[PDB]
Design a protein around this ligand. Structure first.
Ligand SMILES: Nc1ncnc2c1ncn2[C@@H]1O[C@H](COP(=O)(O)OP(=O)(O)O)[C@@H](O)[C@H]1O
Ligand SMILES: Nc1ncnc2c1ncn2[C@@H]1O[C@H](COP(=O)(O)OP(=O)(O)O)[C@@H](O)[C@H]1O
Ligand SMILES: Nc1ncnc2c1ncn2[C@@H]1O[C@H](COP(=O)(O)OP(=O)(O)O)[C@@H](O)[C@H]1O
Ligand SMILES: Nc1ncnc2c1ncn2[C@@H]1O[C@H](COP(=O)(O)OP(=O)(O)O)[C@@H](O)[C@H]1O
Lengths: 48, 428, 49, 415, 130, 424, 427
């Protein structure tokens, strides 16, 4: 039944004028990670 | 440019015959110690002797670290130099033995001439020919060129989402396609759009140029320590850290040495021995010494310089064994010891004048004389500190130079070590 | 659920510090870990030579 | 009403009360007396603002409670923002996730700022309409002086579809990245629309320290400094090349470094291994001018039975400048108490001031500063307006002090 | 928060099947779209640990709580600085209200000399409580 | 030209100067003197190369600079590179990820070699065509012959996940452990300008498509790290294993190695574990060794300590060589007598022969006398020091005067300590 | 079944009456009337559970029954009341601090039993129909009194197919969740009777109404609650090694929610006992924490067995009685155990030998009591089984005096080995 008294968004975002190749590669990295582990993390949804 | 404590020291200052002068390079006095330093500096340039050590012994403030920095400077930049403090060995993440091991593999440099080539320009068209190959047209200010682009890297091409209009890099060796952004002439196509719009390259699309940059052997070891890729969950390597994790002697460094020897035999690589420097060796543990006095006996260990800033004292880790210089007699042998002695009023005055004319402060004669005389009462490392605030007060008073009324008045605002000890004898 | 997401900021000059294609050496000629699951012992010992 | 920051122990300190020639006033900017040490603080502050001779250490010695930390707080306040003033206690380096030497060099890097200039263009207006044709569309922004349409490109349409922003929202759009931010729903969160031009170039400057740069250039999204997840960066591989790249930024027109300030409080907690590292970390170009203080005299050095001033070895003691603080007199103590009362809302009587000054000269200075608020509140208990001598006496009876509590130990407790 | 719960199937379909594993809850009352104000009381350490150990829904960053889940060490710039700034931004606009506390450190006589020496800077802070 | 390994301390020790009858020569293979000690070293090397008994510990002790580490490196060189020889310092086991006992078990298992041999039927040939409809066919080619192969779902999935293409010189075996070995050459310039990092053009294979490959490799018994986790063996390239699960390690590795020894697919070849400066071990590691040496498979031990009656780390007790007596009981101590006026000059001449530092007879005599007065190792540094000092002097042979010139620059431990009367 | 007997398996509880009057040798407890009465008082205080945060210490000579009294209390307490036995040296862990280990130990002896009234069905499956194409089916359950037919739904059909039950099986259907728990098979067999299959076993069908309201109960410890609530790692409270609970975000919330549950009546309380054996191992910091850890309503009573006298406290150089500082020793009241007399040691040996199923002659008892009075009691108890083996090896019936005297010369207790330690083995 416990819950964190506060829940902030996951990323500690960083404002910048970054290079154009960083954000797309990070998005592809997140896409790769999500499509694989979430189907296997489904059983923990009940407790989450 | 951020004048440092040893920025004025630019070399040992020996003559063509190997004798020590009162050279303008930044060192005065210490004739015998500077001669020994210049004699050992030839060992480094000889590139034939490995597994050596030199102990700079002497009272504090006598300039042993200055001698080490002069040795480092005289060599130049081609050979690496890795200054390390003895206290740094005590890492709470990884054992000290492997820390010292890696430290020993960092001095050894490695020069290699890579005649690589990359292709840059606005990508004009992609025509993927089960892909047999993909033709890519790169445009630059000097013309356009079409390249058959190894369909195996079409994966990366799509990963970058690059298409007609973008400016990109590509490395001929591995296919390191890098999207710089959209072309300049395509800007404003949408009056509001999050893009970079990098200028169009001006040089020849075919960019073949040699890179003679050097890398360290420890860098190679680290690059070969952990794997790469996110096959299934191995993506975890872009996350939780990799602090100086321990390599293994039996299967990594041996193969590294084998492959490096192979490449050197082919005439591609070029080895350049470095110089390691350990400050305040007395801080190391007795086990660090027991490992060091046997690891430096190998055939690959680079020449090292030991600096002990104290005399006969108990070695750390035993609390009941006294040895000269805080180094055990077992390890104190095999090490050429160079004594560093105290200076004279004249030498202290010369050092102070050098520091002054290096920092950029002009000082009168009567002022410099008493500033150096203070170097006799106090340590040499106190007049150097007092010199700056004197000029600061002078400039505050309009006077651009340092008169005797400033150096003798600023010595009152700050106290030296001995005066503080005298006052602090009350335990508060 | 605090909307006050911490929001760091810095210029892009701090991120482009490690990108210089025509000034970096190819480390692929020295790597050994990558060859453990791709290359075979026989491939390197008998066939290639 | 009440902010996260309240009336602490060093609120009255607003900076060094020096003249144009670094001459301390009798009492100014919340700093009483302490002429010699305060002017020495001024000299070090001036040579810091200069930022040419780096790698200098100073030690503020003196009896316990002689404004050793007040001088540091005043120096910090005078230096003002835009210049890193790192303050840490000697016990903070003892960390389990990182070695003491690594924590020390980390604090050093944190005490050095890098000034970088940006020339980004930021939009600021209000949304009129957003369109989506499943994809391309158009965007109409509004400000109090003009309205305009915008062609919603791939990035813009995607970002505005992901975000819930809609018509009637004052927003900002960084054309470089496209970060959308809404400062309030509408006219009256709600907030009015912006004024002036809709799109205008804005210069941005970031005083990022070498620590931030290293943490940014260490891992994929390596900006984990927020929780110090890192146990130590790779020395000489990712830490020396950053220095070379910063030097490249310099002497070219790209960036300029800003010498910060480090203040290690209670340095006697640092062990011999930490002092050994300072003997060499203060000899590099990128080294800040640090200050330190210690109330102990010639005590034992943590690590061995050696006795040395400040509990610091001689090798480092001969490497720094000592700044001793003299004990305060009746005048200085009374003026400090008066400034402390002015900081708060308390207003004591003249006889009450004399009684409190005597009480603070009897046992110690800090005890009177602490009794100030106690007597102020006890006065409000009897429904008074001014803190009279009777309230201070009642407090002195209620609350004990170090010297009087130690003497009351005529009954043996645990041990 | 984005969290969507499953209270159960509608109550009117209880007669549809004879026996099922679904739970039946009465048709929710009130408007489909409803808001409400909640007067929550929390501490600053909660925000500190939430920004140091982030969490969220449908984000793979939760992996941090499985392989990188030791106790955190919020840096100075996070424990102080930004958290205090955002809390002040909440306060000065009429949404938050500060309430000091009381830190009762019993059996302090057995702390380490390092703890005692850090208490110096800890108490002198303008944020430290009574 | 300059290799990674230039001349070090123990570089002139290129073997053990013993005859076929293990009779020590006065000067042979770089070693000098130490007749009884080198004969004992050869005796222990004989049982090393034999490899029948396990749990043999030979301790070499003597004054500092008598050749303990020298004899150790001589044995290491006399012993062929095939048998493992793990040389570690007494301080290498004090790890933070490993305990003072698990690191020692890993060091022990690292000195036991295992010559594995494997045989697998390999189908290799240049891919000419790959059709897919799921079912398909494969047209492999060689410079000698060609043939079609019918595939299936399991093979099609492997040909798709591994993006094989017409021309890729594929390598397949039973169980389909396919490898994208190399690419055709007839598809000239598949990459005009930019090529992949893993791509490389290779000539067409020869012979038949089906060829039997035999692979032999010597892996240490510490290969447990290969199965101590789910990693692909790369844990052996860094710290990795820390626990050394006793059940797994023993009851799987030992049993399966014994099974391989019967099938003939492997064979143990015990090595040596040389622990230099072993006096730094605590009573815990010594009491552990006391039992570890009693195991079925355990390499022989070689120790080089110069400690007399000294304290044992982790205790207030004192014992010979600074280690407990219960361990000395399970050792075999060897002597290393100090050198005389003749042996010192001989080893100095040998060391000069290494770096071709041609010295004069008077210089040799003076250096031998200096080394007998102060120390042996010190005289070894003056060789190179005077060589470098004379090189700048525009000379070709170190003289006595050049030796004395260096004698004043680099003072010895004795004279250095004698000069510490100032006490800063 | 097979769990070999231990040194403390003979005591089945304190031999007390209804008035807490200890009997001489009842229920395995021999002699030691004062300490047994004290333990009975503290146990009667335990089964009441209206005050929490007290402690009681049992001190005495080595081998007088401290741990014996602890085990007797544990046994007389029975299940349904958490009892945690821990040695002082167990809290010195590497994955958590000492205070964290102590908090976990305390909260491991606080149980929360949530009474859940879930209605279910229980009957013998007679027939099942399922139309695969959504899929639909039916179910028929039988009990000794009545039968009925059920029109299964889609999810019920899915659950029954996952369980894949068949006719004749006796199952329980949770009306809420639909979980099918099969207790066994009724008198039915032979799916085909021509295919292979294991041996058949049958059990009686359920009785009474088909659908009946029964009472399930879920009893977990506060430590298990804080654990599974610590982090989102799935199936915690076993996880083989790891507890890193946070003080406020979890612990205080667990306490508050347990108080709320007690308020409305979901699970009120069931305090336990934390027997900390050899508490002299705890560090000064452990006692410092215990000082204020007992000052909580969720602090269960603890029992400590001490063998030390006036000895320095571990972690410091402060001499104090029982090796415990007078700060923590101020709360706990101490109980004294009298050394067993001749008739007490004799009867203890008699009971301990009757527990191991060994017969010893009347003179065997006398000689063994002689040995256990000149020597320690534990050695005389250990000599009961050692002497019981030579007798069997000689095909004997009951242990004689000669067998005991031979096994006494075969071994050495504590003094015949130190007296012979005159060879200077090693030091
Ligand atoms: N021969 C010299 N010439 C010029 N400056 C010197 C010389 N010797 C010492 N110094 C000065 O004295 C200081 C001694 O510092 P350091 O080398 O750290 O002391 P030590 O090495 O004795 O511990 C240096 O900052 C250096 O500028
Ligand atoms: N120059 C000054 N002006 C105003 N207040 C002062 C001055 N010097 C000291 N104080 C007061 O006296 C107290 C001395 O305590 P502090 O300086 O913090 O002790 P320490 O420096 O030993 O930690 C401070 O709380 C401060 O408010
Ligand atoms: N018999 C020998 N032949 C050649 N060189 C020797 C001989 N004995 C000793 N040395 C030299 O003397 C040095 C002694 O070093 P080391 O073996 O570490 O001393 P020890 O083993 O006595 O502690 C070695 O570097 C080696 O080159
Ligand atoms: N009251 C008792 N009744 C029966 N046996 C006892 C009793 N007290 C002690 N014993 C016997 O003493 C042996 C060890 O006692 P122990 O619990 O270790 O005492 P202590 O806790 O004082 O060391 C046990 O094997 C047990 O059989």
């Amino acid at each position: 039944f416990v819950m964190p008294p506060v829940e902030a968004p996951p990323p500690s975002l960083h404002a910048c004028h970054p290079p154009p190749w960083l954000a797309p590669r990070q998005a592809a990295f997140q896409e790769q990670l999500a499509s694989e582990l979430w189907p296997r993390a489904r059983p923990l949804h009940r407790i989450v | 440019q951020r004048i440092a404590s040893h920025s004025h020291v630019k070399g040992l200052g020996l003559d063509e015959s190997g004798l020590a002068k009162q050279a303008a390079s930044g060192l005065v006095g210490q004739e015998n110690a500077r001669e020994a330093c210049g004699v050992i500096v030839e060992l480094i340039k000889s590139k034939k002797m490995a597994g050596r050590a030199v102990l700079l012994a002497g009272p504090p403030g006598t300039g042993k670290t200055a001698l080490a920095l002069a040795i480092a400077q005289e060599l130049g930049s081609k050979v690496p130099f890795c200054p390390m403090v003895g206290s740094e060995v005590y890492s709470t993440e990884i054992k000290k033995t492997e820390v010292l091991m890696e430290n020993f593999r960092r001095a050894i440099g490695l020069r290699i001439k890579e005649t690589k080539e990359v292709y840059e320009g606005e990508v004009t068209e992609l025509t993927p020919c089960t892909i047999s190959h993909v033709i890519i047209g790169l445009k630059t200010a000097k013309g356009t060129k079409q390249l058959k682009l190894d369909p195996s890297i079409f994966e990366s091409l799509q990963k970058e989402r690059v298409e007609a209009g973008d400016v990109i890099y590509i490395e001929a060796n591995s296919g390191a396609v890098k999207r710089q952004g959209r072309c300049d002439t395509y800007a404003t196509e949408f009056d509001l759009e999050a893009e970079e719009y990098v200028p169009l390259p001006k040089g020849d699309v075919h960019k073949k140029k040699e890179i003679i940059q050097d890398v360290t052997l420890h860098d190679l070891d680290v690059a070969n320590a952990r794997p790469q890729g996110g096959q299934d969950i191995l993506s975890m390597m872009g996350q939780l850290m990799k602090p100086k994790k321990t390599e293994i002697t039996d299967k990594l460094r041996g193969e590294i040495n084998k492959v490096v020897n192979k490449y050197i035999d082919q005439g591609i690589a070029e080895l350049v021995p470095g110089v390691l420097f350990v400050d305040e060796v007395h801080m190391l543990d007795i086990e660090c010494f027991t490992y060091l006095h046997r690891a430096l006996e190998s055939s690959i260990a680079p020449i090292v310089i030991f600096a002990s800033n104290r005399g006969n004292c108990v070695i750390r880790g035993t609390e009941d064994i006294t040895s000269p210089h805080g180094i055990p007699l077992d390890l104190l042998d095999r090490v050429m010891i160079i004594r560093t002695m105290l200076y004279t009023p004249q030498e202290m005055k010369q050092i102070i004048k050098i520091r002054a004319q290096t920092e950029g402060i002009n000082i009168s004669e009567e002022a410099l004389n008493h500033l150096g005389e203070i170097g006799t009462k106090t340590t040499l490392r106190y007049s150097v500190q007092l010199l700056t605030p004197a000029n600061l007060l002078a400039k505050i008073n309009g006077k651009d130079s340092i008169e005797k009324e400033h150096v003798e008045e600023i010595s009152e605002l700050f106290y030296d070590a001995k005066s503080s000890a005298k006052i602090l004898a009350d335990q508060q | 659920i605090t909307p006050g997401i911490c929001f760091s900021t810095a210029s892009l000059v701090l991120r482009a510090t490690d990108v210089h294609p025509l000034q970096r050496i190819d480390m692929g000629r020295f790597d050994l870990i990558g060859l453990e699951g791709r290359v075979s012992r026989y491939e390197a010992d008998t066939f290639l030579p | 009403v009440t902010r996260i920051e309240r009336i602490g122990a060093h609120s009255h300190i607003r900076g060094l009360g020096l003249d144009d020639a670094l001459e301390p006033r009798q009492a100014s900017q919340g700093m009483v007396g302490q002429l010699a040490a305060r002017r020495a603080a001024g000299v070090v502050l001036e040579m810091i603002r200069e930022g040419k001779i780096a790698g200098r250490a100073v030690l503020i010695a003196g009896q316990p409670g002689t404004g050793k930390t007040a001088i540091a707080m005043g120096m910090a306040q005078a230096l003002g923002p835009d210049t890193p003033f790192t303050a840490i206690a000697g016990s903070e380096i003892f960390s389990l996730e990182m070695s003491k030497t690594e924590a020390l060099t980390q604090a050093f890097r944190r005490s050095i700022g890098v000034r970088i200039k940006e020339e980004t263009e930021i939009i600021e207006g209000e949304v009129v309409e957003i369109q989506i044709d499943r994809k391309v569309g158009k965007l109409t922004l509004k400000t109090t002086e003009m309205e305009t349409i915008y062609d919603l490109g791939t990035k813009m349409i995607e970002s505005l579809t992901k975000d819930k922003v809609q018509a009637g929202d004052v927003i900002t759009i960084d054309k470089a990245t496209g970060k959308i931010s809404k400062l309030g729903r509408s006219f009256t969160k709600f907030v009015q629309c912006p004024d002036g031009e809709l799109q205008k170039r804005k210069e941005v400057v970031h005083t990022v320290s070498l620590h931030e740069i290293d943490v940014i250039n260490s891992r994929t999204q390596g900006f984990l400094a927020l929780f110090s997840g890192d146990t130590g960066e790779i020395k000489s591989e990712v830490r020396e090349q950053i220095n070379a790249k910063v030097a490249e930024w310099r002497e070219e027109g790209k960036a300029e470094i800003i010498p910060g300030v480090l203040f290690i409080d209670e340095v006697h907690m640092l062990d011999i291994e930490s002092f050994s590292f300072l003997n060499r970390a203060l000899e590099s170009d990128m080294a800040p001018v640090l200050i330190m203080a210690t109330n102990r005299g010639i005590t034992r050095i943590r690590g061995t039975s050696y006795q040395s001033p400040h509990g610091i070895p001689i090798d480092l003691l001969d490497r720094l400048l000592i700044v001793s603080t003299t004990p305060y007199s009746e005048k200085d103590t009374k003026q400090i108490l008066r400034i402390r009362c002015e900081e708060e809302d308390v207003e004591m009587s003249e006889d009450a001031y004399t009684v409190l000054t005597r009480i603070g000269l009897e046992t110690s200075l800090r005890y009177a500063i602490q009794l100030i608020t106690a007597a102020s509140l006890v006065c409000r208990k009897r429904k008074g307006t001014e803190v009279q001598v009777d309230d201070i006496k009642r407090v002195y009876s209620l609350f004990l002090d170090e010297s009087r509590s130690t003497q009351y130990m005529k009954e043996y407790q645990d041990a």
